[PDB]
Write a protein that binds this DNA or RNA. Structure first.
Lengths: 404, 404, 408, 408
DNA sequence: CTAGTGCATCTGAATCGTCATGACGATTCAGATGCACTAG
DNA sequence: CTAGTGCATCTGAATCGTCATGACGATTCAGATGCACTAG
């Protein structure tokens, strides 16, 4: 068990499997590795052990780097990475801080992910520092050997279920809907109560399919998740009439010399003919807010702000593309539309479904719910910013409204 | 190290130190696991290991399966599965055939997915056999070392977002590679045609009642016209889940000395709980445009402009009510709403269904058709200004879309 | 002398002619042409005369009796042949029958001019509870503000005075106000170094100059055309709204909707450029009418006037054609107006909005009620693409508020 | 009929009148009043009559000959008492003597309004070789510009169109026809327009002083804290944004959403009041080198940073609590800030918006790609309740564009 | 004696047709680069 | 783990065809400007 301590300014860890073989490797290569992550040198060793004394009584004293400005500074040659790493005194110096399960280096992937040579700072009051609870979240959800075996087992299960009965979970729910359909529809005459029971069964089917996709189909492609969500967009939002995929729009602002082609992934036409955009994003992470507030205000994530800005680029290119774009989109999609209706670009807006919010089971302050409600109406060209749990809550509220 | 070879009908595994540890573990628990995926027994040794013979010089031999009709018959105890595995002789026997990256079981997950007790045949001319060329397609879809590296970079990028501004774009690199491998065959999509005829039968039932109301029920009163449309409002606009009638609104502006009670005739509640207004008016012949233009522009008529101002006064007195009106409207309407939902006044907007456009029989010009679309979008707090002919036009566009 | 009386169903009136005038003329003209015109407006055939005059009876004691109209459903239905018009005239019983209903000063027919304006056949209904009826207060405003011989002579005198004033001395009152501004500026700027207190006093002098020039144009320059009125208001539009950097006139827009086959040219009269280069428009309308709300409310709500709604609809055509024009509009308006702009700056159409200055609202008289003020602010904030809706009195009130805020 | 015939040096006019009219009233008015108003435009004494009428002779056979003046040096000199003015009127011989020269359509006096508009004592000279003379083509353009019968008919139809616009749907567009007719008769000239060059130099000095103070604060006041950076930028907020007339500091607003059980006080740092009374928020922040863009794209899209999103979220707190505060907030803010505001002004919370000045863009230093500026301007126009997001370098760019526009 | 209507005449603007030109988008093709999969 | 290598991708000339805009020339219709008669 590696034991960490600090003596005055310097930080001297104690290490205690043959100790004599570690000394022979340190004399042989001039470098030694402790637990396949902590690389060390003879200069990092504070004092050499003598061969006369017992090596088992002696504990190995290695320098972990100097402590400066209230920061345990660990250099890059110890962790075999590019930049240094700074740890605050509030994070206890421990083997599990620098290592994941089955000897996976935590900061090696972080150093491979950062282009800038500026150091990684954990904790404290630095402006570029990572907070403490974000670091425990990174330690809990690191892609270690247990996570990467779980991802590979879930993907191979997802590939093999796609080859045999790819939509068997939605087919069972649709067969349950068809069994509930003939029970409700006893007579061929349609009234308002039987219609309300059929809307209850339809919204229950859509809610159960979306919940079963959230439980089991999260380890899919973005195109596969979108192809899961296409046949229910016009039922969740019955204003819109047609779902259009890979809609080629014209961009003139990113390259001023020549027109660039851009592609809206999912686009929506309502009954008047106006074109709108929906962004159905795959729920990779379970947050809609950053887990620490900036200045006691919770800010949106990079995943939320990426989808808003992509939809705003689509809205910008449609509004700049104008009546030439109206004629081009009504020439591209005249056969798919009902007859007599043309595609119009008249102030297009966007719908964003991103990823989960953890409103349920608690774990949210009134300020967090206030920031989430303010953020869902913050933007100009978004008529709806939804999470997947907001979609399930809207479906549930529509179910108990149609019941009563 | 595993070598795949076959002599006569038998198939021989060779494993190349730790050879003694495999034979010692076979004596303890009467089962071993070699390369994490293959299970062998004491019967499974083609020749037994010898203690006087050196285990480094000794080479393991394991009768993997029998060769009958060019099929290698693997028992299920080796792969720890209930079902048998048969592989054609055209498929080369390899560790990559049985195992993907991170040592997941290819026939382990496949056995769990399968429901039939027929065994798994790979290759050959059998009708129950998996084809060889689609087994290489399944093996190419399985995650290699580049996918698990891209998933590990994207998972850290999902956690540390908004804290490290200099990280590489790993979420874009992961999802662009994952779109190349799609698990959905797309010919197994859910056929929702039985739901779509019920949406046709719902929208035709709304369209036939309203068109019968425009021809015969015009002799009824204004409140008798509103009563007829109230059960179809939440079906026509499924964003709104609750219809509220005679909603008392406090007025502080028409009389500055004392509060005045004002009444919204029909009010609408969203699934989130936001409060909106619908103004259902009696249809007459020309209720949108005046007969003569003003300064070559067709202006709204006095019947329409009084209808917008009646809704805009309701929006003004709701917005000026503030947080004291959200507590008042929730307390008056908690039993009508679903549980856990409060009425919130967060930018209320109005829907007006007024008059008949008479676009066809009237044969209005392109100048009049230009002015007709501008009036519906000329008001900040009106999301939808409709005629009853436009409501029938939007209902007909739903029916033609759901048909094809 | 004409007097109106109600016997039975049919409305009668008696022509009491002058003693010097021979009453026989009405009867000999009815014998000759079968029509007679008394008081130059009212026309009567022989079937309208109830009693033909006896030749033995002296005419001066006799009074003629004419079927002026029929009273039915509390409405006096005057035929159009009486007023020499094509449509009927329906007068409510609350409006008493006199010559002043059908005449302005020096025998000007009200319903003749009104009938000429109407292209259809449908009758004119005055007063009462019909939905097509002109109200009684609106009819009294029509009688008070009719273009009679007094109004047309006053309009011609004001027009001739405006034209002669344009020819000689041009704009003199604005030059005198600018000379007063220059004198106050020379009093205030005693130091070449510019200070924030001196800047506030110079902003006070500039805003009093703009307020007095707009007030003098409202007092004396109402009878000019909109080209002349917009030429009066354009050098102070940038100073009134200093977000806007350049005033552009006769901006050629392309309209692809009014005709789907071919592109139509449209022209914005005044268009404004921001400092970013965004292009918004302004509608400066000449104040022909003294009101901006309708005089009677429609079902307890005060609806806007046709002048205001026409200005909003014209600005919405301009905003719609600029938004539909797209990036080709930005390239065309950049190439058309490159030399007018500052260097390195281009026209961009990114959600264009409009400012409307239409005409007066009579708030400062105090005749408006609380609901009329409430409906006035709701109309001012009602529309989507209009950032500012102004009257001229709202412009003067906002200028006075900036002056009193800068004074402290 | 009026005929102007000259006999040697003097010029007479024959007054025919009408056959139905009796022109004995001319000699009767000359007998008692000693003046007669001929054709409502001319005045004549008893000495102006050439031949006195005889009672033995028939009046209708006699034609009244009044002298109009004396012709000398090819100039018809008309006395001022003839046209009822102070000064004389000189008409050249080349201009035909007619009633239309002296009168317009509605019997207005052209030389009457001309002598009313002329400041000096000197007589009106029309035509000829004199430089003081009004030229013949200029006077004929003035006579063509005067209102004829088609102008008054269109004005009358436009006036009763303006009275009855909301009550009669079927009236023809008379306002469009009258204002389109008036646009071809312009009054003002472009040479007479007001030269506001001296006023525009003061605006150049104002925006130059503000730009130099802001740029010197960017170069050397980086060390200054955030609150005193706000205190530096407060006296220029009204000048940069002249829509807002009052700057309010530490505005206590009431919050009911963060704590349902009890009300918490929230404090807007700087708040702005319109000239109408609408309340807005300005968020003046400390400038930094990279606080707009996050400098690495997320899905090939540059996302806003944590600092800018925190500023937007704080302004959205202030806008949300002002909107949820309602009418009680308007009475509370009016009661709290009655003495700071001008008289007659109340604070109204009617859709409040925010302006955020955040930090330097770093465009020319960064040399960013056109996609990066595209992501940047989409960030500036992304949010609903922010009317105008800007940087400090963007503020300097708008100031430089305003200065270069006011230069020319 | 002003209000009101009818008419002949000149004129300017909306329109249609045609012709010319230039810009712009679709298609091709190739050279080169970035990516990603696999073997020593 | 790292280098070789094949493939998908982006990007720049480069041609071509079509469309959209502008300008000219005839045309006709509605507008506008006077005369002109008319009513006790």
């Amino acid at each position: 068990m590696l034991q960490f301590s600090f003596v005055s300014n310097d930080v001297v860890m104690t290490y205690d499997e043959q100790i004599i073989w570690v000394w022979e490797s340190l004399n042989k290569f001039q470098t030694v590795c402790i637990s396949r992550i902590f690389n060390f040198q003879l200069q990092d060793l504070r004092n050499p052990p003598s061969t006369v004394q017992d090596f088992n009584d002696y504990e190995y004293s290695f320098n972990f780097g100097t402590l400066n400005n209230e920061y345990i500074t660990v250099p890059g040659r110890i962790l075999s990475i590019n930049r240094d790493v700074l740890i605050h005194k509030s994070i206890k110096l421990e083997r599990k801080v620098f290592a994941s399960e089955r000897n996976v280096s935590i900061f090696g992937r972080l150093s491979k992910l950062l282009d800038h040579t500026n150091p990684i700072i954990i904790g404290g009051d630095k402006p570029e520092a990572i907070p403490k609870s974000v670091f425990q979240e990174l330690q809990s959800k690191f892609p270690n050997t247990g996570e990467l075996d779980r991802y590979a087992n879930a993907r191979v299960h997802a590939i093999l279920a796609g080859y045999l009965d790819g939509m068997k979970d939605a087919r069972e729910r649709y067969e349950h809907y068809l069994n509930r359909k003939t029970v409700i529809r006893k007579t061929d005459k349609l009234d308002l109560e039987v219609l309300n029971k059929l809307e209850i069964e339809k919204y229950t089917l859509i809610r159960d399919i979306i919940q079963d996709a959230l439980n089991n189909k999260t380890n899919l492609s973005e195109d596969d998740w979108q192809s899961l969500m296409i046949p229910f967009i016009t039922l969740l939002f019955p204003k819109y009439i047609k779902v259009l995929e890979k809609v080629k729009i014209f961009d003139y602002y990113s390259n001023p010399s020549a027109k660039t082609n851009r592609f809206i992934d999912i686009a929506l036409v309502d009954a008047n003919g106006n074109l709108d955009i929906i962004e159905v994003k795959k729920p990779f992470d379970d947050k809609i807010l950053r887990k620490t507030p900036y200045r006691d205000n919770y800010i949106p994530t990079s995943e939320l702000s990426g989808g808003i800005m992509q939809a705003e680029k689509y809205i910008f290119h449609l509004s700049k593309w104008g009546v030439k774009g109206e004629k081009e989109l009504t020439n591209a999609y005249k056969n798919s539309l009902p007859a007599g209706m043309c595609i119009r670009i008249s102030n297009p807006k966007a719908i964003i479904i991103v990823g989960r919010d953890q409103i349920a089971n608690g774990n949210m302050t009134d300020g967090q719910l206030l920031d989430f409600e303010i953020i869902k109406r913050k933007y100009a060209n978004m008529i709806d910013i939804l999470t997947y749990d907001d979609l399930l809550r809207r479906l549930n509220n529509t179910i108990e409204a149609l019941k009563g």
